[PDB]
Design an enzyme around this catalytic site. Structure first.
Site, PDB file in Angstrom:
ATOM      1  N   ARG A 189      62.968 -56.635 -41.949  1.00 30.83           N
ATOM      2  CA  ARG A 189      61.667 -56.695 -42.635  1.00 30.83           C
ATOM      3  C   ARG A 189      60.539 -57.035 -41.663  1.00 30.83           C
ATOM      4  O   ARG A 189      60.677 -57.938 -40.833  1.00 30.83           O
ATOM      5  CB  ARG A 189      61.686 -57.730 -43.765  1.00 30.83           C
ATOM      6  CG  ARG A 189      60.306 -58.067 -44.348  1.00 30.83           C
ATOM      7  CD  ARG A 189      60.431 -58.682 -45.727  1.00 30.83           C
ATOM      8  NE  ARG A 189      59.165 -59.176 -46.274  1.00 30.83           N
ATOM      9  CZ  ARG A 189      58.716 -60.425 -46.160  1.00 30.83           C
ATOM     10  NH1 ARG A 189      59.413 -61.346 -45.502  1.00 30.83           N
ATOM     11  NH2 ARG A 189      57.555 -60.761 -46.711  1.00 30.83           N
ATOM     12  N   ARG A 195      40.539 -64.592 -52.881  1.00 31.20           N
ATOM     13  CA  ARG A 195      40.383 -65.758 -52.022  1.00 31.20           C
ATOM     14  C   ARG A 195      39.072 -66.510 -52.289  1.00 31.20           C
ATOM     15  O   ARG A 195      38.195 -66.047 -53.010  1.00 31.20           O
ATOM     16  CB  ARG A 195      40.474 -65.350 -50.544  1.00 31.20           C
ATOM     17  CG  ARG A 195      41.888 -65.148 -50.045  1.00 31.20           C
ATOM     18  CD  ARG A 195      41.901 -64.853 -48.560  1.00 31.20           C
ATOM     19  NE  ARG A 195      43.257 -64.599 -48.074  1.00 31.20           N
ATOM     20  CZ  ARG A 195      43.561 -64.195 -46.840  1.00 31.20           C
ATOM     21  NH1 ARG A 195      42.607 -63.990 -45.932  1.00 31.20           N
ATOM     22  NH2 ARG A 195      44.831 -63.989 -46.506  1.00 31.20           N
ATOM     23  N   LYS A 229      56.793 -55.371 -55.772  1.00 29.04           N
ATOM     24  CA  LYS A 229      57.050 -56.804 -55.575  1.00 29.04           C
ATOM     25  C   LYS A 229      56.792 -57.699 -56.792  1.00 29.04           C
ATOM     26  O   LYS A 229      56.800 -58.925 -56.662  1.00 29.04           O
ATOM     27  CB  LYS A 229      56.235 -57.341 -54.399  1.00 29.04           C
ATOM     28  CG  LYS A 229      56.818 -57.060 -53.028  1.00 29.04           C
ATOM     29  CD  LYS A 229      56.003 -57.778 -51.942  1.00 29.04           C
ATOM     30  CE  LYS A 229      56.386 -59.251 -51.751  1.00 29.04           C
ATOM     31  NZ  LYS A 229      55.530 -59.928 -50.724  1.00 29.04           N
ATOM     32  N   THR A 281      62.656 -64.567 -51.004  1.00 16.40           N
ATOM     33  CA  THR A 281      61.868 -65.806 -50.957  1.00 16.40           C
ATOM     34  C   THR A 281      62.646 -67.027 -51.426  1.00 16.40           C
ATOM     35  O   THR A 281      63.477 -66.936 -52.334  1.00 16.40           O
ATOM     36  CB  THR A 281      60.534 -65.710 -51.808  1.00 16.40           C
ATOM     37  OG1 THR A 281      60.803 -65.880 -53.207  1.00 16.40           O
ATOM     38  CG2 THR A 281      59.821 -64.377 -51.599  1.00 16.40           C
TER      39      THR A 281
END
Ligand SMILES: O=C1NC[C@@H](c2c[nH]c3cc(Br)ccc23)N[C@H]1c1c[nH]c2cc(Br)ccc12
Ligand SMILES: O=C1NC[C@@H](c2c[nH]c3cc(Br)ccc23)N[C@H]1c1c[nH]c2cc(Br)ccc12
Lengths: 583, 583, 583
Positions: free
Chosen positions: C32, C73, C219, C277
């Protein structure tokens, strides 16, 4: 171990007190009376012969009345007999006439509105078949092409391959017949030529005036009937499948296919089904049936038939007792050889999965897996006996009923052997009675497992809603069990270590006071152990658990009380010991 | 859609070139020759009549020879006829004598070592039954109590209710009969009165001298045979079940139970079974069978029979063609009405789960679930056609064989319709041929699914070991498919947005160049979409995926090429479009 | 026997040629590359280090590129840091501002149209959670109640608990990132923050311009994504499940429940799934994982995950090799301990029953029941390798592929160990190659069973459509088999009756010329028999069949050819004999 019920048509050859006895003994569950023929006098006579012989032999036998039904006949013929050529034309008149190879009348005047150009008409049970060429309502005549040639007597029958034959549900005769039924508290009425729900209802309204409580069994003889099979059962208490009647209006090649499908459709709703007619018709003349008859009887039972009927074989035949005997035989044979696991699995998918049936399902499985000797079914009406019957368990069903008459209605459902015990109010009484009743039949003794099912409380009983599994008593000894297993084996009460020394196979359950160091060599060789007094970590207990032998410690005077050599069954969990074989 | 095969006993009533044609046409798969009667001359004549009529009509019909077998007979009687009282005694002598109500001889001299005190002996196919009182090997006599009275002709038969009847496997006659078989390349031999594996082997050793390749079908007539049914099949190529023969030595009440069990036991090993005798014996005299005959024939097929035989009905009966026609009818009827899901599920448990069967299992399920039209089975010997037949799939089995003779052996196995195509070497050729062969039968066309199975490589073929699922061609258009579903529907080639405006139901698949804003209202109302050129996120593509319609974009000249109004099937995955119905 | 694949995030701690080797060896199937950080320079460098080390060690390792994705953000803050009280109010402005405990700006200016009064907003990956008090589009400000107090750095992230966050599918950066992918023929792209099909399609349209053939793996990080899981897979080649990302926007208590449901939903369509994860995040600092990590990894594999990923553990962690080693370990462990019967049964119900899948079903069952060593799957694209993988069979899947790249795509699907052999045209070549390839892996030898599956003909290959079961050669001897069974056992070539007299246990297969009277005592004590010459009813043959021993007669020079004492397996049907263990 009998299961499939036997209906026998009473007749000249079987009216006698003597032969009715011999038929009940050969295995007759239900006496049929055919009202196609004979007078109320003759029938009332037989009903009494039956009722008396039945209560003398102390057996439940029910009475079934078979209505003659609506029909289509030919009005008389010129000279009595009359012929019809194979390629010619005949006229079917709606107005009465003398017979002729041209003009020719029928008792159903409305025939002409039911048929149409090209439709077939069958004379004298299919002897000769006509076909509709043209129709004139002018003259009210039906011109037809005679296809198969042959003769024709006077008052002979006529059939119209469905064709919504528009006859009524019941004759005026039938109406009189069935009031007679209500007067003698007869148990079944077999309504002929049923084809719509109406036709049944016509009998049920008559019954409800009298509040009669009789079961009503349609006779599905034609396409319209087959087609309406679901809707008819919706409104009917059971069903007959006469194949001889049915073979006329529909091709014999197609018949068994339909027989199967009908019986299936009964089992799906738990309505009893009788397979009827042409069963052992060789046995009227002969003393033993053919192979193809034996085959067909069995294949009825494989199709799933609650019962099996005998027409002429018992009515006017030469050999009545033999035909009944042989009927029972073929039954026991082709049941013996059938897989109740598949059978149950089959019905579990087939019948619906609903609050009403929940218990029938549980009982049938529980019965198969634990190998229970008898399912005792407690019923007022009988619905519980039929809810259990429909799932076809190996176990013998026993219907304990306060109602004498619901007992006779049971006598036809599959597998159910009914008894009349008197009404208990409390669930508790219901349960203890059941267990008593099952033992007093004799079919169950002390070793056996029993499923007791009923709708409780017996008041608000709609459907069956409880079951109890029950060992038929009754722990001869007990105490603190160690381990959790169980075995069967013959005892060997040992006073000394030497009281089992040079005389020891395995296969036995030893009964001492306690275990020493000198007992511990012999215990491991044995099947089970019953020590007199002791605690859970005792020498007797610890040596059992370790070696994997089921034992019971803490048994009051075990050496003195329990006998030697008698076969016994111990249960590690529970901590009980039993007389012979257990579970 | 025919499935269950028909064996017909050729006789006087059916020797003719004419009537053999009419019987092949009525549905005859296998001609039976009974060597119980008639000379090699008569038989050789019929074998040629059959072979010629068969190759003229271009149909595979096999030849089966039924050996007469060993038997026990009575030596001639004084005056020809002689009587026997119902409570008396008769002497069964091992030395030949003239008949008398006292002394009486049999051709099997060793009888006396097989029976014992109390054993039963049946005379003239069960006409009168004796019972052994005492035995003196001194005089070599058997004193018996005559139980049922009756007459007795000369050379009449005798049966010993097993009783390990110690006759040989085959007569000297039989040995001659079977060499005749080997000389005419006959396809089956139906060995009579088989009871142990030896009895079969006696025929197989003869065959192996000649390297004959003929299938050998035991006739199980007695208890010893029934008992040895597994061991017999171990060594046999098939099985017959004559019930008439079997009904003599064992009770007719018990017969069907056994019939079922045998046929089961064949199906378990995939050996073809013939149910024989007493089928439609009414049709010798009459033109249409009874209901109980129609019932029994069917119940054969429900029991699981690869085939069904006709004795006198076609041999010397009055109505040969009708009996064959009606046989086929009852077959088609009682197959029509039977649940291939249960059937397959049933055989999946029943037959063993092994490397040899793996593919039969996969093929049968795959066939049921995907609704394939035909399973084309490629065989040298035929084992693959039988491995597939034994799991009883709805799909029509097609046996493509290079061997003409293995083709005729196939003609008896259940469901298998055999064809002779010429040997391909490579797997590839095998596959493409199959697909061709299936289409050229006519049973499969372009829409249909086909399972091609064989043992490859065709050299080291022991057992069947591969399958291919195959759509019978052949994408008329194709391109980039969007979505993953599929539908059937009639096309509507749209040049303009207005070329589908006021003339639009649903149920159609639209074919345009691309999609505008003005097309996107009409697309959602439709079944499918085929746009000419485009990419994956195109207006045409995005509008299809979003609305859940299967589409294909990127179709070469889709508006010009694919016709209007013709019914079509699109497949979203693949991105193919097809002529009519697909899968 | 490895099954579940391992994806490793390359980073500083693992860039080296040395450590990439040690990771491929520890079991790394897919490298990855996280484009959240680092420059195309750094990534191009690692892609070459990987490609070279991989082709040196001659192992397939794929390259996966993980897009950074769209995000929300915070615009810089006054002093850098800024605080927020626990019961106060903060203003979320859509116009950029300096930070203050009152006024405060976000890069996603459109936020205000997505939220509403009461909706929650999460700052800095959930560090402090706000809640919308009121909205004024006048000032374009969002007044919020600060619920949990805490600090706030500059360019920190913001999450909106779905909320149809209206960001685009991909950044402009992402678009540049993924073109880089297309330039290096990278094998996977893991698209971040996917939530609708559009978001995937945005990457697929880019790929289709280039005709790139790369697999696209969503994802799913938020509710909108979970909710659209079916529709997303419809348009996606695989799927990731990052839990760390997912845990932010949805409660950790609810996370595993969702993880399970997603993976399930992949398996249902046969799309490969990566669980990602927070796997072994303790192993960044430590050399061995905790129990709860070992538990979670396993529970991924129990949930049904085609693969398992490592983020920091391999990227920048202290112990990269150990984390890969330990990943493989936990995989092998919790696969070892899992019931492939349930597993298959589970997927048989779960995945759809369709023409596309037919063969996957058959192969999986066939594989389980016959205990086949390897399923060799022949693929151009890989769909056949995935059609087999999805049904999860114990057997090791082998993907023989002409395409090098589709081989790398395979390296992630469950259980599939891919190899690149060169294209065969004919089905026959395909089959023989397979068998070769399986043996040359070494995983299968001569005893073993093999299932060869592919789509044929390899041209019109849409879906997999044929299987072949195949014993990996190769009969050392053969002849006429008698009986139908088989056994394994060590030989004992006997020249004389005395050549096996006082030296005979059971468990052996004897090899003589023929059987005398003097052999027949010894044969019954043995396991199998191979006699040299003979026929079917021979002394050798008859004595085998009778005693139930599998034998083969007619074996060319059996005494001379087949060795003594070597273990052998005979097969009665077929009439073959084999080197060691067979089937
Ligand atoms: O075999 C079964 N089939 C399905 C099923 C089932 C039982 N009761 C039901 C009620 C409704 Br409502 C729906 C389904 C069922 N139960 C098991 C089973 C039942 N009783 C048992 C006793 C023993 Br002991 C062992 C096994 C079983
Ligand atoms: O056990 C089974 N479960 C379900 C099922 C099944 C098989 N093929 C299918 C195709 C479709 Br399309 C849908 C369902 C099925 N078949 C049997 C079974 C199959 N192949 C076998 C091989 C051996 Br060896 C033993 C048993 C089986």
């Amino acid at each position: 171990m009998r299961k499939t019920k036997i209906v026998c048509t009473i007749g000249p050859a079987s009216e006698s007190e003597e032969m009715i006895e011999k038929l009940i003994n050969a295995g007759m569950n239900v006496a049929r009376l055919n009202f196609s023929h004979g007078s109320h006098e003759e029938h009332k006579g037989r009903i009494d012969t039956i009722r008396k012989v039945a209560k003398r032999l102390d057996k439940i036998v029910a009475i079934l009345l078979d209505t003659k039904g609506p029909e289509i006949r030919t009005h008389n013929m010129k000279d009595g007999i009359i012929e019809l050529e194979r390629g010619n034309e005949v006229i079917v008149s709606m107005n009465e006439v003398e017979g002729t190879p041209e003009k020719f009348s029928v008792t159903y005047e409305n025939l002409i509105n039911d048929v149409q150009v090209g439709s077939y008409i069958l004379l004298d049970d299919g002897l000769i078949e006509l076909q509709v060429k043209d129709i004139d309502h002018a003259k009210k005549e039906v011109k037809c092409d005679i296809l198969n040639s042959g003769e024709l007597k006077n008052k002979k029958g006529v059939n119209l391959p469905g064709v919504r034959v528009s006859l009524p549900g019941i004759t005026e005769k039938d109406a009189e017949d069935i009031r007679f039924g209500i007067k003698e508290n007869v148990d079944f009425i077999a309504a002929s030529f049923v084809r719509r729900p109406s036709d049944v209802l016509e009998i049920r309204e008559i019954l409800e005036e009298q509040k009669a409580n009789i079961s009503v069994f349609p006779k599905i003889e034609n396409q319209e009937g087959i087609d309406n099979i679901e809707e008819i059962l919706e409104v009917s208490d059971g069903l007959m499948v006469a194949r001889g009647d049915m073979g006329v209006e529909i091709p014999p090649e197609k018949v068994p296919m339909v027989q199967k499908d009908l019986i299936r459709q009964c089992n799906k709703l738990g309505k009893p089904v009788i397979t009827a007619t042409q069963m052992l018709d060789s046995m009227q003349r002969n003393p033993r049936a053919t192979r193809a008859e034996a085959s067909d009887v069995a294949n009825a039972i494989y199709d799933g038939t609650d019962a099996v009927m005998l027409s002429g074989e018992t009515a006017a035949g030469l050999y009545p007792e033999e035909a009944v005997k042989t009927m029972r035989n073929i039954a026991v044979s082709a049941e013996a050889a059938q897989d109740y696991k598949k059978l149950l699995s089959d019905r579990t998918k087939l019948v619906e999965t609903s609050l009403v049936n929940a218990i029938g399902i549980s009982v049938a499985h529980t019965a198969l897996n634990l190998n229970v000797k008898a399912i005792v079914a407690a019923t007022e009406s009988g619905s519980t006996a039929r809810t259990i019957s429909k799932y076809r368990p190996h176990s013998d069903i026993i219907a304990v009923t306060p109602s004498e008459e619901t007992a006779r209605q049971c006598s036809i459902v599959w597998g159910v052997q009914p008894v009349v015990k008197k009404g208990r109010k409390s669930t508790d009484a219901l349960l203890n009675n059941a267990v008593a009743t099952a033992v007093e039949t004799g079919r169950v003794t002390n070793g056996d497992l029993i499923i007791i099912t009923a709708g409780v409380p017996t008041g608000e009983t709609g459907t069956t809603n409880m079951m109890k599994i029950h060992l038929v008593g009754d722990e001869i000894a007990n105490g603190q069990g160690i381990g959790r297993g169980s075995v069967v084996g013959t005892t060997l009460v040992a006073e000394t270590v030497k009281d089992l020394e040079g005389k020891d196979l395995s296969d036995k359950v030893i009964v001492t006071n306690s275990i020493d160091e000198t007992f511990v060599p012999y215990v491991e060789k044995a099947l089970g152990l019953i020590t007199e007094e002791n605690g859970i970590t005792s020498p007797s207990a610890i040596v059992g658990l370790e070696k994997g032998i089921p034992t019971v410690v803490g048994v009051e005077k075990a050496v003195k009380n329990i006998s030697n050599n008698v076969l016994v069954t111990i249960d590690a969990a529970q901590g009980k010991i039993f007389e012979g074989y257990a579970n």
